[PDB]
C-alpha cells in the first residue's frame, strides 16, 4: 500500500552472470523447478549457434529490441466513467515485460518442445514474428495511438 | 554395568531427581560415565475448541517428556546399594533395567 523499499536483488545467470538474464530464467521458471528452466532456456539460448554461428550473446538483447514497448494504457476511475490515460514504461519493466511476451507467447507456439519452441521465438523476435512481436503494436495501438487522453 | 533412565515431564523434577544420582549414587564406588540429556519425545495435540461447528476453531496442546540417562558404569555393592534409598519424586519414571 504505502510501503516503500527497494527491488529484490536477483542472482545472475548460472554462467554469464547477468541479472537481466537472471529474472529472465525466473519469469520462465515454473513450479519452482528452476533447474528445468535453466536446462530449457540456457540450451535454446546457445542453440542459436546452429541458427547462426558465432558468439551468440547480444542476440538475446537484440531480439528483445523488437519486443520492447515504451507506452501502455491505464484505466482511471475518474470523470464518472473510466479513463485510459496511456503512459510510457520505465526501463525497470520494459526489459521485464518483454521477457513475458517472449515466453508467455512462446509456449503456445506449439512446436517440437518448450526447449526449442522457445529458441525459434527469439529468432522471430528480432525478425518480428509471433504474438510476442504482435503484442507490441497491438498494445501501441492504444497508447501514443490514442493520446486524446494521454 | 547397571544403566539408569529418568523420564519426567520437565526439569523442575527431572533435575533434582538426576543430580541426586550423580551425587548419591555416585561417590567413589559407582563410576558413572556421565549425565546425558537425550532427545525429547514431543507429542502435541489439536482439539476443536468450540462445541460443535466452527471448524476454524481448534486448540493445540503438547506434553514434553523430558528424559535423562547418566547410568552408573560400575557394578559394585557398597555404592550400587545406596540408590534404592531414593524413591521420592511425585513424577520421575526411573526404569532401572540392565
Amino acid at each position: 500500500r504505502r510501503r516503500v523499499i527497494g527491488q529484490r536483488k536477483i542472482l545472475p545467470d548460472p554462467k554469464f552472470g547477468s541479472e537481466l538474464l537472471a529474472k529472465f530464467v525466473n519469469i520462465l521458471m515454473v513450479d519452482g523447478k528452476k533447474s528445468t528452466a535453466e536446462s530449457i532456456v540456457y540450451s535454446a539460448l546457445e542453440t542459436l549457434a546452429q541458427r547462426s554461428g558465432k558468439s551468440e550473446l547480444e542476440a538475446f538483447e537484440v531480439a528483445l529490441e523488437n519486443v520492447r514497448p515504451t507506452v501502455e494504457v491505464k484505466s482511471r476511475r475518474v470523470g464518472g466513467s473510466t479513463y485510459q490515460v496511456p503512459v510510457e514504461v520505465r526501463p525497470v519493466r520494459r526489459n521485464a515485460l518483454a521477457m513475458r511476451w517472449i515466453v508467455e507467447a512462446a509456449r503456445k507456439r506449439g512446436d517440437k518442445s518448450m526447449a526449442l519452441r522457445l529458441a525459434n521465438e527469439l529468432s522471430d523476435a528480432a525478425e518480428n514474428k509471433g504474438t510476442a512481436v504482435k503484442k507490441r503494436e497491438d498494445v501501441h495501438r492504444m497508447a501514443e495511438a490514442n493520446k486524446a487522453f494521454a | 554395568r547397571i544403566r539408569i533412565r529418568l523420564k519426567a515431564f520437565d526439569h523442575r523434577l527431572i533435575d533434582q531427581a538426576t543430580a541426586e544420582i550423580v551425587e548419591t549414587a555416585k561417590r567413589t564406588g559407582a563410576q558413572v560415565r556421565g549425565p546425558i540429556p537425550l532427545p525429547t519425545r514431543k507429542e502435541r495435540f489439536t482439539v476443536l475448541i468450540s462445541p460443535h461447528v466452527n471448524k476454524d476453531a481448534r486448540d493445540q496442546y503438547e506434553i514434553r517428556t523430558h528424559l535423562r540417562l547418566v547410568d552408573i558404569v560400575e557394578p559394585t555393592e557398597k555404592t550400587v546399594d545406596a540408590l534404592m534409598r531414593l524413591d521420592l519424586a511425585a513424577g520421575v519414571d526411573v526404569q532401572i533395567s540392565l
Binding site: - | 495435540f45 482439539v47 475448541i49 462445541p51 486448540d59 496442546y61 503438547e62 506434553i63 514434553r64
Partner: protein, 96 residues
C-alpha cells in the same frame, strides 16, 4: 450421551472379555490355517455383542464418542477443561 447408551458399552466390554478376549482365541485357531472347520466357523456365532469391534469408546467423562483420544479417554471439550484446570498432568498450550 443418554443413560441407556452409556450402559450398553459397559456390557459390550464384559461379554467381549469373558468370551472372545480369551475364548475366541480358540476358534481363531481352527478358523485359520493351522494345519477352517465349518462347525467352528458356525460356532463363531454363539454370541453377538461379544466382540472387540462393537465398542465405540465414548467419552470416559461424559460419553460423547466424537473426539476421543486414548491418551485422556476424554472428548474434545473435556480434555479442554481438564487441561486448563491442570487436572491433566504436564499439559499446556502448544506453540512453535
Amino acid at each position: 450421551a443418554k443413560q441407556s447408551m452409556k450402559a450398553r458399552e459397559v456390557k459390550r466390554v464384559a461379554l467381549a472379555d469373558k468370551y472372545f478376549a480369551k475364548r475366541a482365541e480358540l476358534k481363531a485357531i481352527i478358523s485359520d490355517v493351522n494345519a477352517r472347520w465349518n462347525a467352528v466357523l458356525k460356532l463363531q456365532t454363539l454370541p453377538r455383542d461379544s466382540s472387540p469391534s462393537r465398542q465405540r469408546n465414548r467419552c470416559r467423562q461424559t460419553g460423547r464418542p466424537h473426539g476421543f483420544l486414548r491418551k485422556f479417554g476424554l472428548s474434545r471439550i473435556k480434555v479442554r477443561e481438564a487441561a486448563m484446570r491442570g487436572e491433566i498432568p504436564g499439559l499446556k498450550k502448544a506453540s512453535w
